[PDB]
């Protein structure tokens with residue numbers, strides 16, 4: 514299990530871009546790809562996880578554990594107390610995976626403390642915890658991500674609202690940005706300011722699996738059936754070919770079976 518480090522406290526659009534590129538190259542399957550777009554690995558492939566160490570201002574760090582298969586965040590850890598490693602596992606993580614998050618995030622058995630996230634990783638759950646009707650009401654941004662790391666890291670106790678806000682920002686700026694070139698671009702274009710995700714970034718996040726299946730199944734660049742998406746203005750956007758959606762997509766969800774590689 515490799516760790517990718519990104520300093521949020523001091524970066525540039527180029528460093529952010531290199532970060533996402535390293536994560537994509539680390540997450541992706543060496544050989545899997547459809548129409549030039551790299552695809553995530555099978556649940557069987559090792560390693561199964563990838564760590565993302567986020568270095569914020571004021572020496573505040575938080576490490577995110579990501580499942581390579583779908584890039585979902587399983588949980589995160591932070592340096593706690595003196596030399597203790599505090600791991601936080603999502604409520605929706607179960608079975609052997611819970612032990613993997615615990616031992617992968619905090620590899621030192623003698624000095625690890627736990628603080629479970631008492632809710633699941635679904636956006637609607639995160640949005641209700643954060644106290645909003647939609648995550649579009651929560652601004653994303655480098656400085657915002659840095660600020661949230663400071664509210665969590667090393668902090669004895671924090672509200673579920675504060676933890677949810679952190680998750681909402683971290684997931685979209687890390688996982689969602691790695692999956693979609695479009696979302697990466699939105700971040701870079703608004704790099705020096707806070708911004709609200711437009712209808713297209715939220716739609717893209719919510720239909721990633723469908724897009725991945727559609728592209729994998731497309732024949733001669735034509736989607737099996739018309740894909741109804743939403744553009745940046747909030748208007749219906751009908752896609753018929755892979756060429757029309759490919760520019761906004763960096764990574765495909767794992768879809769079993771063969772597909773036209775290029």
Ligand SMILES: Nc1nc2[nH]cnc2c(=O)[nH]1
Pocket residue numbers: 584585586587634635636684688689
């Ligand atoms: N852990 C996790 N929860 C999510 N909720 C919506 N998208 C995601 C994601 O990529 N990861």
